[PDB]
Amino acid sequence: RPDLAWLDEVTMTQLERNPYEVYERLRAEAPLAFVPVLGSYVASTAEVCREVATSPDFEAVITPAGGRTFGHPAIIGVNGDIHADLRSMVEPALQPAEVDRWIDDLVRPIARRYLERFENDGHAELVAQYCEPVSVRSLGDLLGLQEVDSDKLREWFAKLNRSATNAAVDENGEFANPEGFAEGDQAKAEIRAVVDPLIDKWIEHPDDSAISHWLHDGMPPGQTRDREYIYPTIYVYLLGAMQEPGHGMASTLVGLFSRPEQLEEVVDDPTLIPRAIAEGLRWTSPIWSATARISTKPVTIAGVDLPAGTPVMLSYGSANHDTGKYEAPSQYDLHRPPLPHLAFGAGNHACAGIYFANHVMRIALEELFEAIPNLERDTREGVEFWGWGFRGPTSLHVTWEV
Numbered sequence: 001r002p003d004l005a006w007l008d009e010v011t012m013t014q015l016e017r018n019p020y021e022v023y024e025r026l027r028a029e030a031p032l033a034f035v036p037v038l039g040s041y042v043a044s045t046a047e048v049c050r051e052v053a054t055s056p057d058f059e060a061v062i063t064p065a066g067g068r069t070f071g072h073p074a075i076i077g078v079n080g081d082i083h084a085d086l087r088s089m090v091e092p093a094l095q096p097a098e099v100d101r102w103i104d105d106l107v108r109p110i111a112r113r114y115l116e117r118f119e120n121d122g123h124a125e126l127v128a129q130y131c132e133p134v135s136v137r138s139l140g141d142l143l144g145l146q147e148v149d150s151d152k153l154r155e156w157f158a159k160l161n162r163s164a165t166n167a168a169v170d171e172n173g174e175f176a177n178p179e180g181f182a183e184g185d186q187a188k189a190e191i192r193a194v195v196d197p198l199i200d201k202w203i204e205h206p207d208d209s210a211i212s213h214w215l216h217d218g219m220p221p222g223q224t225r226d227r228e229y230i231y232p233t234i235y236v237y238l239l240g241a242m243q244e245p246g247h248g249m250a251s252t253l254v255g256l257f258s259r260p261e262q263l264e265e266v267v268d269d270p271t272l273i274p275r276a277i278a279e280g281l282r283w284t285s286p287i288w289s290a291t292a293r294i295s296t297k298p299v300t301i302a303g304v305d306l307p308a309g310t311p312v313m314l315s316y317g318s319a320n321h322d323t324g325k326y327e328a329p330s331q332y333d334l335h336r337p338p339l340p341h342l343a344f345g346a347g348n349h350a351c352a353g354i355y356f357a358n359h360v361m362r363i364a365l366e367e368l369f370e371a372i373p374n375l376e377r378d379t380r381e382g383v384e385f386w387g388w389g390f391r392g393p394t395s396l397h398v399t400w401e402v
């Protein structure tokens with residue numbers, strides 16, 4: 001497309017370090033645009049992302065690097081009967097009435113345990129010391145991975161992240177960094193070595209762990225889902241479900257720190273924490289551009305006539321800065337009027353764990369502010385955000401008196 005020739009010079013590193021300038025141009029010039037280094041059409045505005053994610057003429061497809069990382073059948077990448085089965089598999093523990101039965105007793109003691117290690121230090125790096133540990137320890141226990149240390153869960157989601165977002169392609173559409181999948185493969189090998197004996201045990205001795213229920217739920221007597229059938233969705237969990245609540249917590253904190261007067265409001269009135277988190281997710285969406293759909297027939301989107309079989313990456317993080325919806329979206333604003341956002345996606349492949357994730361982030365922030373009410377950010381340190389597929393702050397140094 002001739003007038004978008006500047007897109008030929010957009011690099012993967014540029015999109016990873018800060019995609020917002022390129023995507024501001026995309027939202028104005030071409031809400032649906034083919035980005036050469038990603039090898040795909042990308043949807044950048046709220047209208048186009050929502051349309052593609054809910055269209056009867058699109059279905060789920062995994063991004064190329066995500067498919068290389070997860071294989072088949074990843075819940076995010078399949079449709080029809082297989083997707084219906086995988087959704088029925090994961091949904092029980094995520095049902096709101098079910099989450100409300102045990103979420104407090106799950107997350108609150110975990111939050112306190114990680115806080116107790118540093119709440120009197122006067123300094124902390126909250127991404128590694130708090131946000132990621134609470135996120136992974138909560139989900140890990142729910143899944144049945146109690147004996148997998150939070151360091152290991154965090155390492156796995158970091159390697160899966162880099163593998164599943166290893167999207168750069170060369171002139172011929174081939175992956176430009178083929179060695180970047182190796183640490184994904186390696187993480188998967190480690191995961192198998194840990195999880196295979198757990199599955200062996202759960203097949204014979206089911207328990208209340210989520211993965212045990214994934215094996216057994218809805219199955220004829222004496223049968224379990226084959227482990228090869230559920231492992232790709234285990235990997236989906238061990239990337240985004242492990243990573244995103246921690247990133248959403250951390251981005252919300254960075255946003256609040258940028259508005260000191262709003263941090264103070266929320267600490268004074270913790271009933272504002274859900275609103276603070278909702279704005280945090282819009283402001284820096286944890287899942288920024290990690291999923292996609294594929295057209296199933298010829299379809300016209302944003303004036304582009306797409307053939308059948310055309311993938312479209314859903315850059316929800318860009319859609320959540322759509323100035324057709326938001327005023328000054330690059331600024332964190334607790335007092336933004338509550339509007340729909342796309343940080344959980346849309347359509348039949350929208351996030352299945354919204355209610356759980358919101359509670360994990362809420363409880364974690366409640367306990368943090370109770371333990372450290374005079375929390376401040378360490379302004380001697382910069383906060384850098386990283387990621388195009390998944391985005392969040394790489395560190396969050398804080399300080400407090402005493």
Ligand code: HEM
Pocket residue numbers: 053075076077087090139237240241242244245248281285286287291292314316342343344345346347348349350351352353354356357358
């Ligand atoms: C703040 C934290 C989270 C955010 C921002 C988030 C966001 C998202 C997004 C954007 C998608 C893709 C939706 C689309 O393509 O339209 C997704 C899919 C999904 N998420 Fe969440 N997620 C979070 C946490 C979680 C957690 C903790 C779990 C599990 C306990 C979870 C389970 C899933 C599943 C199973 C899918 C795939 C749904 C499908 O393809 O049918 N998510 N999430």
Ligand SMILES: COc1cccc(OC)c1O
Pocket residue numbers: 066076164235236237238239240241287290291
């Ligand atoms: C590409 O990987 C993912 C995309 C969307 C959601 C995920 O975990 C919930 C996830 O792991």
